[PDB]
Structure 1
Amino acid sequence: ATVLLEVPFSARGDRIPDAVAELRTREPIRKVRTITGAEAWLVSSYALCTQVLEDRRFSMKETAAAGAPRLNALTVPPEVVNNMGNIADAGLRKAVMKAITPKAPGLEQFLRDTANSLLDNLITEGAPADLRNDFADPLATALHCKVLGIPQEDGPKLFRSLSIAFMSSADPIPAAKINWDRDIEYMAGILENPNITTGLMGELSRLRKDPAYSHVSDELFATIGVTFFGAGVISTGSFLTTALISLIQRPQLRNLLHEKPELIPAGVEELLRINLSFADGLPRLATADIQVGDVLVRKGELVLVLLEGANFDPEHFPNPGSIELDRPNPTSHLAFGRGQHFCPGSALGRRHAQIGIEALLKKMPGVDLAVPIDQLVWRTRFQRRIPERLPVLW
């Protein structure tokens, strides 16, 4: 006798477990147990993943309901689970979107300058270099300080919340509340700070005083700053880090992108498709009884949408484990989700990765791992899969 299959399967972000393809073929929706001890339906085919994400009867906001089966413990107040819905309801969705596009004047130049400065410092210090802690994460942090309009010098302290804030824990995390409350206080001060006139926080500070937003709560304005910083930083830094691993392990691709940098955006799209940065399936709670494949999901049950299930499904992406720059459906992956909750930072995230890679290949065309790949230490019980250090030589 064996216990019910447990998720997640592996914290390793450099290979997909052979188990995923077996499940997809035999039982593309099947029962699993989460770290909390709750039961859930794990969905692993492209067809079923899309079905779930496109049906709002599978609710994100209801995952925060008291008494619901949980993937993991809340690390924010339950209202913050509906963050984008609260933003929308306050009339702020267009303004937030506009602030977080990579089209702002000078933003791309800033990214390229920051990336080049980080790499120059690594070259000066000499090999081995840690591309996570000393490149990808500081590049993500600098980008989000600029996008938010907050001082660069404030980035590191906000960044140090994230190793706890994005934990995937069975139980509530006392440190997460301490850091949340502190970061909220910081963003509330930013909104009252007359020096802050650019970026997302500059725009929120203005809208706060406009009569059309006089009844929007101060709690929401501060929340938007904390959540967009955290979500953007953890996502872009984690994605770039694990994409660099995939690229480094493919010298032929590294050489092609070095030689033809106009292929970088197609490259990043394939790196997005094969990315294992999300450690857990995307959670949804059924609000009705809904047929998904061979299973009738009952109202109040938890469903987990496995992104790598969808993105390595050979029925949608033939030869799924291969990077192919000429697929006919290249942006049809689920790396940014799908439907109501599609990532509002998708363009910024693509641009962060494209620029980080372009700059790396120009400065370190011979970049290679400085340790055997099995020596990378993969962070556990976290909402992302990331190596603690990424040592490289060049």
Structure 2
Amino acid sequence: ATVLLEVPFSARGDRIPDAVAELRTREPIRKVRTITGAEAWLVSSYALCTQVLEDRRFSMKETAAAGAPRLNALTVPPEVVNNMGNIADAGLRKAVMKAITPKAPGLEQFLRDTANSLLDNLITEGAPADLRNDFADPLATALHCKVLGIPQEDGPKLFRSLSIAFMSSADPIPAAKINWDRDIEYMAGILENPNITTGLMGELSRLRKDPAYSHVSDELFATIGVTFFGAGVISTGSFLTTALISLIQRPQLRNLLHEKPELIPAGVEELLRINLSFADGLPRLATADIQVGDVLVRKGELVLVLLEGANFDPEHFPNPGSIELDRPNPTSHLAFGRGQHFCPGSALGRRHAQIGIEALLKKMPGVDLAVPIDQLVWRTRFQRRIPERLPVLW
């Protein structure tokens, strides 16, 4: 006798378990047990993953309901699971979206200047360098302070909430509330601070005093700042870190992109496709009885959409483990999700990674791991897969 298959399968972000392809072939929707003890349906084919993500009857917001089967414990107030819906209901979606595009004047130059400064400092200090803690995460933090309009010197403290805020825990996390409440107070202070006139928080600060938004709550304005900083920084820092591993492990691709940087966008799109940064399937709660493949999912059941299931499905991406810069369907991966909840930061995340990689390959064309790959320490029970340190030489 064996227990019900447990998720997640592996916290390693440098390889997909052979188990994923066996599951997809034999049982592309199947029952699993999460870290809380709840049962859920794990969906691992491209066709069924897109079906779930394009049917709002599989609800994000309802995952927060009391009594629901849970993937993990909430680390935010339950109403914040519906953050984007709340922004939209408040009439703030176009303004938020506009503030977080990479198109703002000087943003790409800021990204390039910051990346080059971080890299020059690593070159001065000498090898080995830690490309997560001393490149990708500081580049993500600096980018999001600029996008939000808040001082660069406030980045580090907001960043240190994230090793707890994005935990994937069986139980509530006391520290998560301590840091959440503090970060909310910080963002409330920002809205009242007359120096803050640019970026997302500068715009929210103005809209808050506009009569057309007079009944939007102050809680929501502060919440948008905390959630967009946290989601953006953890997602871009973690994605760039694991993309750098995939690139370092492919010297032929590293050399090709170094020699022809015009291919970097197509490279980053493949690095997004094969990325293992999301540690768990995306959760949804059924609000009706719905057929998914051979399973009739019942109302109230938890469904987990395994992004690497979709993104390594050979029926959609032939030779899925290979980075191929000339695929016919290159952006059709699910790295940014799909449907109602498609990532609003997708363009910014692409540009963060493209500029970071462009800068690294110019400054460190001989970049290579400085330890055997198995020596990377993969963070556990977290919503992202990341190595604690990424030691490189060049």
TM-score class, shorter = over 0.9
Separation of aligned partners in 1, 2:349 and 2:150:
19
Please state whether the residue corresponding to 2:284 is helix, strand or coil.
strand
**Deviation by residue 1:313-334 (Cα, 9 ceiling, x = unmatched):** 0000000000000000000000
Separation of aligned partners in 2, 1:110 and 1:86:
31
Separation of aligned partners in 1, 2:295 and 2:379:
33
1:178 deviates by 0.1
Separation of aligned partners in 2, 1:224 and 1:42:
30
1:335 deviates by 0.1
Separation of aligned partners in 2, 1:147 and 1:30:
41
Separation of aligned partners in 2, 1:359 and 1:134:
14
Confirm or deny that 1:153 pairs with 2:153: yes
The corresponding residue for 1:88 is 88
The corresponding residue for 2:323 is 323
**Deviation by residue 1:132-160 (Cα, 9 ceiling, x = unmatched):** 00000000000000000000000000000
Separation of aligned partners in 1, 2:10 and 2:86:
34
Please state whether the residue corresponding to 1:150 is helix, strand or coil.
coil
Separation of aligned partners in 1, 2:12 and 2:360:
24
Separation of aligned partners in 2, 1:260 and 1:336:
26
Separation of aligned partners in 2, 1:76 and 1:7:
22
| Structure 1 residues 100-139: aligned runs within 5 Å | 100-139=100-139
Please state whether the residue corresponding to 2:238 is helix, strand or coil.
helix
Please state whether the residue corresponding to 2:31 is helix, strand or coil.
strand
1:96 deviates by 0.1
1:115 deviates by 0.1
Separation of aligned partners in 1, 2:34 and 2:256:
41
1:231 deviates by 0.2
1:48 deviates by 0.1
1:391 deviates by 0.1
Aligned length: 394
1:183 deviates by 0.1
1:82 deviates by 0.1
Separation of aligned partners in 2, 1:252 and 1:183:
44
1:230 deviates by 0.2
Separation of aligned partners in 2, 1:56 and 1:160:
34
1:352 deviates by 0.0
Separation of aligned partners in 2, 1:94 and 1:212:
14
**Deviation by residue 1:235-290 (Cα, 9 ceiling, x = unmatched):** 00000000000000000000000000000000000000000000000000000000
Please state whether the residue corresponding to 2:223 is helix, strand or coil.
helix
Please state whether the residue corresponding to 1:47 is helix, strand or coil.
helix
Separation of aligned partners in 1, 2:178 and 2:5:
34
Would you identify which runs of 4 or more consecutive aligned residues in structure 1 move more than 3 Å?
A: none
The corresponding residue for 1:194 is 194
**Deviation by residue 1:310-358 (Cα, 9 ceiling, x = unmatched):** 0000000000000000000000000000000000000000000000000
**Deviation by residue 1:155-190 (Cα, 9 ceiling, x = unmatched):** 000000000000000000000000000000000000
1:216 deviates by 0.1
Confirm or deny that 1:74 pairs with 2:74: yes
**Deviation by residue 1:28-67 (Cα, 9 ceiling, x = unmatched):** 0000000000000000000000000000000000000000
Separation of aligned partners in 2, 1:129 and 1:35:
34
Please state whether the residue corresponding to 2:80 is helix, strand or coil.
helix
Confirm or deny that 1:314 pairs with 2:297: no
Please state whether the residue corresponding to 1:215 is helix, strand or coil.
coil
The corresponding residue for 1:387 is 387
TM-score by length of 2: 1.00
1:207 deviates by 0.1
1:296 deviates by 0.1
The corresponding residue for 1:59 is 59
Separation of aligned partners in 1, 2:127 and 2:19:
37
Separation of aligned partners in 1, 2:99 and 2:279:
28
**Deviation by residue 1:371-394 (Cα, 9 ceiling, x = unmatched):** 000000000000000000000000
CA RMSD of aligned residues (A): 0.1
1:113 deviates by 0.1
1:109 deviates by 0.1
Separation of aligned partners in 1, 2:15 and 2:127:
26
Please state whether the residue corresponding to 1:285 is helix, strand or coil.
strand
The corresponding residue for 1:373 is 373
Separation of aligned partners in 2, 1:159 and 1:230:
8
Separation of aligned partners in 2, 1:78 and 1:115:
36
Please state whether the residue corresponding to 1:19 is helix, strand or coil.
helix
Separation of aligned partners in 2, 1:217 and 1:251:
51
Separation of aligned partners in 1, 2:205 and 2:104:
18
Please state whether the residue corresponding to 1:201 is helix, strand or coil.
helix
Please state whether the residue corresponding to 2:231 is helix, strand or coil.
helix
Please state whether the residue corresponding to 2:304 is helix, strand or coil.
strand
**Deviation by residue 1:204-255 (Cα, 9 ceiling, x = unmatched):** 0000000000000000000000000000000000000000000000000000
* Structure 2 unaligned residues grouped into runs of 5+: none
Separation of aligned partners in 2, 1:352 and 1:161:
21
Separation of aligned partners in 2, 1:291 and 1:211:
46
Please state whether the residue corresponding to 1:392 is helix, strand or coil.
strand
1:22 deviates by 0.2
Separation of aligned partners in 1, 2:107 and 2:215:
32
